[PDB]
Design a protein around this ligand. Sequence first.
Ligand code: NAG
Ligand code: NAG
Ligand code: CA
Ligand code: CA
Ligand code: CA
Ligand code: CA
Ligand code: CA
Ligand code: CA
Ligand code: CA
Ligand code: CA
Ligand code: ZN
Ligand code: ZN
Ligand code: ZN
Lengths: 396, 396, 276, 276
Amino acid sequence: MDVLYSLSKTLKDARDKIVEGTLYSNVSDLIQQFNQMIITMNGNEFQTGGIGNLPIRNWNFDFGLLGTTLLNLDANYVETARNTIDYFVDFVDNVCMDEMVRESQRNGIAPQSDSLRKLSGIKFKRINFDNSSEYIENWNLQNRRQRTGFTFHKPNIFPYSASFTLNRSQPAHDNLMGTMWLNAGSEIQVAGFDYSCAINAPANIQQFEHIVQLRRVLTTATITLLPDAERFSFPRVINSADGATTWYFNPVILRPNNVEVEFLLNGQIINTYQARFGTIIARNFDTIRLSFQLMRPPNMTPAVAALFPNAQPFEHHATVGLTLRIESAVCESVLADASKTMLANVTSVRQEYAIPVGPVFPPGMNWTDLITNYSPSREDNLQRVFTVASIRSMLV
Amino acid sequence: MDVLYSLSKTLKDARDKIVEGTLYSNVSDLIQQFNQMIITMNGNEFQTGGIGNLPIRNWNFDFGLLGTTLLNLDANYVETARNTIDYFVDFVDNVCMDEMVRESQRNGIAPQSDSLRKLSGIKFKRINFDNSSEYIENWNLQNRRQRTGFTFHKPNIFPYSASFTLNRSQPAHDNLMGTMWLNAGSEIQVAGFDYSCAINAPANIQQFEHIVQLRRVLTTATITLLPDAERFSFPRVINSADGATTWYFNPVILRPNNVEVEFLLNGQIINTYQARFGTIIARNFDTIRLSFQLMRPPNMTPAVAALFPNAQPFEHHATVGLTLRIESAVCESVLADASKTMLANVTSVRQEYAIPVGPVFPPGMNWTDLITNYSPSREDNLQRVFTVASIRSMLV
Amino acid sequence: QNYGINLPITGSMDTAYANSTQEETFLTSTLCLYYPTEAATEINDNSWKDTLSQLFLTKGWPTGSVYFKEYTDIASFSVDPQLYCDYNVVLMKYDATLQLDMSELADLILNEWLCNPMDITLYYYQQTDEANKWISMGSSCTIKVCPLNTQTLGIGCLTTDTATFEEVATAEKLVITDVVDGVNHKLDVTTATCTIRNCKKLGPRENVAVIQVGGSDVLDITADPTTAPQTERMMRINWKKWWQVFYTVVDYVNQIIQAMSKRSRSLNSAAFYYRI
Amino acid sequence: QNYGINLPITGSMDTAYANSTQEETFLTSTLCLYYPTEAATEINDNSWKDTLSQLFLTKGWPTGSVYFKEYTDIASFSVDPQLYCDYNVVLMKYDATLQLDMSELADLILNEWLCNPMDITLYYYQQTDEANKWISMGSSCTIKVCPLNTQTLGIGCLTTDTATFEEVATAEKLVITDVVDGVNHKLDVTTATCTIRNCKKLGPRENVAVIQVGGSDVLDITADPTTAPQTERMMRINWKKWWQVFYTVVDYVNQIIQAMSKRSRSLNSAAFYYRI
Ligand SMILES: *[C@@H]1O[C@H](CO)[C@@H](O)[C@H](O)[C@H]1NC(C)=O
Ligand SMILES: *[C@@H]1O[C@H](CO)[C@@H](O)[C@H](O)[C@H]1NC(C)=O
Ligand SMILES: [Ca+2]
Ligand SMILES: [Ca+2]
Ligand SMILES: [Ca+2]
Ligand SMILES: [Ca+2]
Ligand SMILES: [Ca+2]
Ligand SMILES: [Ca+2]
Ligand SMILES: [Ca+2]
Ligand SMILES: [Ca+2]
Ligand SMILES: [Zn+2]
Ligand SMILES: [Zn+2]
Ligand SMILES: [Zn+2]
């Protein structure tokens, strides 16, 4: 991996720095690195694989070194370098593609393609140099089992799930008490609905609790917590849990009462925020417990009093919302996020060459299925293919 | 850890090989290793034991080297070696005990005691040599993030749980349909009981399902599957779920029908056995889904026909069973089992010196509570203390 | 159930809809149509019940599933009404004079009640909360009330002299008395021809539908003056002939049943739950 | 709260037993005792009800919680046994000539029945399954049966001529008719004098225990000939005085109540299943 990254890094640096007119002192170290790459790769044969529709490609390296005598680079020097760079870039792109479309259940962190296995030999370790990208840095750190961290803007941590729980129900579905939620991506919209508006509840308070278990621990997470859930504030016709029938939902939004968001790690409470909504920090947690109460307003104007009768029929159902958006966090495991393209790149390469479904990942690299069942083997394979995708995106 | 293991291994070799009359050629390499150990440890001060009732011990090393000039070892040589070995064995035992009684939430894999921290220094790495035990080999592989493997006979993967689920029940508990199970250690005994004997069930079949989610993935597992659950095959008076009343269970055992044992990984069927009993192999799984059926006998003798009336009262309750024993398996994580003594060693040491409950392990090193909530921090601390206990048992 | 009634039920908002359960519901259900005597008198056919049963069969109901029960009038029907089938549709003729009795009958049959016996001759009774009412049924129910105070002496009435009692009901078949809550009352009722029960309105009864034949919306199944809930089970039609009324009931039986929820039928046929 | 749906309940086999709830149930529950008239006749004591109430109070039942209901005889009581207390104990005198009726009475109140109306002369009726019976009740139940074939022609009976109908019941206060299943039967009943209902035996009734006084084991609450289930709610006692019988009932009331359980169909948990 470090060798493949070093090849790609050398090629990117050569593309950016070997330019017409530049001082040779600007590229001296780069030229020495590039010539070392040429010498190491010369005389070697590689085969990038025929898995799926990815075509079998053979690579042979017999290149001359780049010159070292110029004071400034000229057009001829740049074009001569560009020919070799283009061949090397094509080879690295094909190696990355071959690796990305492969998985194993035993050593998913180990190389899976023939070319990357060959590059793991000692003779290619001379190519290795500056490993400064986030993914390669994390790769080297976790190879030594040092504490790693991936920074994610809007981490796609929550598997998609639009569900509801009914604590009070009956076949008519006209006096219902419960919660409905969407946990999608980096957002949780939850809403507790009481159809009676806690008319007969003790103290006229209806307590709602929503627990979300993250499949991986998040640290240094910045989160927005808005009082209302705009997703569950309009009339809906909702299937029943068994799908037998539908029920009507006609929310009227009351501000949630005694809002308490707890962030927990291994069942211990790490962070707790009460009646706070701007922007909160969860420093280290794997579970989010949201408590919110529907408090019947003791005083009502005639319209409000009309909306909430003493007994059935209940036609305007008191709903208290909550919206939690993890804007940024840090995870020791690779995750899909809103900014990075690693997941999209891996999925695109697997779809373009019609890669048969493997024993590790769900078909189509579906992220909901993956993050729902984020096992250590899946984590290893995913980190491998994501690091390879970043290496590829350095060039393509 | 490698240095502590090397010390222990050198001492065990010295105890077993430095014996009167033996050819020096039998011990030459060991004598070199032992002298290296003495040279490295000479002039170093260690302190062990300040937690619980573990006494404070100070350790000073000023020892002479063992001779190299003899042809066969004699009494003098053995006595000098034995004195040095006794001191070193005492020191290693105390260091192991000092490490076994400590835990950390953050870096529980890293050394905790001061002596092991000192031994992690470069000036002790010369002591390191043959790391052949499964626990130290797994430790080294885990350091490099290679696939680890622990072989277990009768692994204690299931936390103890004797519970039941009633799918049909009434306050009098006389027409009950449901399941009762014991998941203990390496055994799962599950029984589905129908009091009506599926008189009114569609097609005269009652379906029973039981899902056990293992906390760690198991590979290369040998499983005995037997048709009957003898634990749930005798008359029994059982507390109700809330414990407000007791109900009666008078089982009559019918053989289970359409027995399907699935071993799942990430919710996908890896292994599946349909009406197969005796020894089966589950190559890689984290879940066991046992689905069986009570099929009402289409033909009955007068005794059998009398057991099961057309309606209540039901005095004989038709029960189908299943027993699943994991004889041997492989896990990437340390686990207690029937043959090893690592858990017993750690628990005994923590009990003898009255080690206060820590932030990682449950009180008393309760294995059920430990494997129920087997968190990564718990796993790291447990691998550390189990490796130390295996190192200790080499000498103590 | 009872060991799991207080347990949550979780459903996903993408579970596919099952097919229509209307045909199966009709195949496994019983229908009870309640009509007044004047309906049968005006139809003047001896095979009209068979005609309705066959038409329902064209509408999916099995043959012996739709039953017909006749009552003399609203006041008579209100004496121990007995709802028999899974679905009970009551064709109630409208009268500008029987408005309160229509409302009381609709209240008694469109809501579930938990009732306990009262001993007016011994104890003084009060209505605890806004759902606590008194329901009196009999051939002739006359109910008179004497409100009391914390010292048990009556206000505007004398316990010894019944004549001073503030009468609330006279010559009634069904009456729903609602007195001020928290005040002990002494009651005089015609115990010979009237039974009064302390009842609590538990909730709606969803397997009883009331089609008001003619008239306007006058039903008031709620004691609270500020609310007059018109629900899916309170239909109203305009009529000239009873045959057209029954044709409308048969044709839109899909809509009528769809407006009612099954599983509300009790083991007993009474309109109230009697607990000692 | 989640009424009308069945959820699995999970319990651990080591949950601690709660304390005895017998005292609380006695405090908060009512016990109706049903005895024949001749028992009160032979007792002769006007204040016997108060004496038995005080004895129950010594057994822990609050004063006024235990009710003493009287019935003339088995046949008359069987017309419509309506049991409304939390716990019902029916004292039934044994008679060799009335055996079946005794069984019928037991089979009527030791089991729960879901009964739909039957309209003979307008529908042919089948008994679908083992649990589908026809319960006829009234002053005099005389029921005659004509089994039809697939062509609707009666078998050994002429539909036009009722006199040829096979006869199953004659002048009965209560009768449980079980006919061959899968056969349509025309029914002739004294409708003006007896009402017949198509009933399904849902399951046992647990709040009613019948104590049979004198005699032997004769009750048969199941129509299947091969079963005579003697449940724990069917007791038997030898006697020479009714006072000794009542003293035995009071003394061993703990055992009687233990053999009984709160009516499952009733109470909040069984809401929107059938009743309450
Ligand atoms: C439901 O309806 C669909 C479409 O009409 C049909 O294919 C299917 O067989 C029906 N039955 C069930 C049980 O889904
Ligand atoms: C239960 O019984 C025990 C033992 O007599 C007693 O200590 C306790 O107070 C009782 N009540 C409860 C609610 O536990
Ligand atoms: Ca009235
Ligand atoms: Ca007055
Ligand atoms: Ca009132
Ligand atoms: Ca009103
Ligand atoms: Ca009889
Ligand atoms: Ca005949
Ligand atoms: Ca039959
Ligand atoms: Ca029998
Ligand atoms: Zn629902
Ligand atoms: Zn063994
Ligand atoms: Zn139970």
